[PDB]
Amino acid sequence: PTYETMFAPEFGPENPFRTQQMAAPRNMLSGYAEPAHINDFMFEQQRRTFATYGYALDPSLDNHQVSAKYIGSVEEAEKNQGLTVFETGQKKTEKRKKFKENDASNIDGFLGPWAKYVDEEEQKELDEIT
């Protein structure tokens, strides 16, 4: 196999008779679906990074042929300067103090991890809808 064979472009006016979606490559009726063998842990880490903080690195192979950015909402990534969820962060801010009873001696007073937190007109419309 040679690079010049597969990298050779296609002659033509690109056939703009079709729509954008039907001219686009596929194997499955919705996009070219193909297997993969990513590391489990870094998949889960950057997944949880996006799921919490709304940014992650982008997965690709041949989008621009160079892709090294972040995605989602961009500016909050550099607000935290690219930290993760498994890191003891630079500050301990907006924490929320629970009250603990971990003796197992008092009864109806022991709340271990089950501790409920220290924090603890529409019905006219609801009756007229029902």
């Binding site: 590391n39 842990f41 498994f86």
Partner: peptide, 28 residues
Amino acid sequence: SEEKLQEKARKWQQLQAKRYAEKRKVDA
């Protein structure tokens, strides 16, 4: 460039302490 020169070491020897840590080579 300034503190990233050791913050990248923090992230790398943070991440690699879970990349291969828990004997990936709990079951029963």
